[PDB]
Design a protein around this ligand. Structure first.
Ligand SMILES: [Zn+2]
Ligand SMILES: [Zn+2]
Length: 263
């Protein structure tokens, strides 16, 4: 079973972007004069945690206007229907992943036949496309299609001001190859390897100042948070870590491809 995450203190990352996630499954709140955007609904058990985190920061759960995800797997999206029911947020999902959301996982190219991965079916209020923007209260997020891990995996970017300086924030959706994924002659998702290679090209040339991800462990949330509490100059500003992480996962993809092609 997926290891149930533990709660994590919420905090401001930079500018109007806040962490409201767990010690593992990462969720983000963007606060604007015209309401808030939430990214990743996580497990159903995490929806009360997300609500508690938002409120702890002094914001209103009922001000959640838009719900986004990193990608269509249960650990980022299972909680979406609950959040819709509780806030009436508008759910926006990259086109290639919509079928998985509508079907609660039953159409998943890999996990269609694994009932332990299914989640509550939800409707998508706006279908997104590569490079499409999500705009609220003057804040502008950009959806980047970085496919492979899912057909519609989305890397979310925005610009944040912090201490009079400008930073590109990048929430890497995932370019991990899950155990069991078939990269050669995939029957359901033939372009899976071409899609990962595209994601690598995009991410390797993407400006990345504030380094984030769909899972805390991607970007060293725990140790960085400890530095933040100690008052350090924004430890979430980590371009080197971001470049090193993208390089590592690009190499991991080619390591797994080699294994499947020659092992
Ligand atoms: Zn996933
Ligand atoms: Zn995940």
């Amino acid at each position: 079973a997926y290891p149930m995450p533990n709660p994590f203190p919420p905090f401001r990352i930079a500018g109007n972007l806040y962490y409201v996630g767990t010690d593992d499954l990462a969720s983000y709140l963007i606060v604007t004069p015209r309401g808030n955007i939430l990214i990743n609904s996580d497990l159903e058990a995490n929806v009360p945690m997300i609500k508690a985190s938002i409120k702890k920061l002094g914001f209103k759960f009922s001000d959640t206007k838009i719900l986004l995800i990193s990608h269509a797997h249960f650990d980022h999206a299972a909680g979406s229907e609950l959040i819709k029911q509780q806030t009436k947020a508008k759910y926006m999902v990259m086109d290639e992943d919509v079928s998985v959301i509508l079907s609660g996982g039953k159409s998943d190219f890999h996990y269609a036949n694994d009932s332990s991965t299914y989640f509550t079916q939800s409707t998508v209020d706006k279908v997104l496309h590569d490079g499409e923007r999500v705009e609220l209260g003057g804040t502008v997020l950009t959806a980047h299609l970085t496919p492979g891990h899912t057909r519609g995996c989305t890397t979310w970017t925005m610009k944040l001001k912090d201490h009079g300086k400008q930073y590109q924030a990048v929430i890497i959706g995932s370019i991990g190859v899950n155990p069991g994924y078939k990269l050669v002659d995939n029957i359901t998702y033939p372009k899976i390897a071409e899609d990962y290679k595209h994601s690598i090209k995009v991410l390797e040339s993407m400006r990345c100042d504030i380094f984030l991800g769909s899972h805390a462990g991607m970007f060293d949330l725990k140790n960085k948070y400890v530095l933040l509490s100690k008052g350090q100059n924004n430890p979430f500003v980590d371009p080197t870590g971001c470049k090193n992480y993208i390089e590592q996962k690009a190499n991991d993809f080619y390591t797994e491809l080699k294994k499947q092609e020659t092992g």
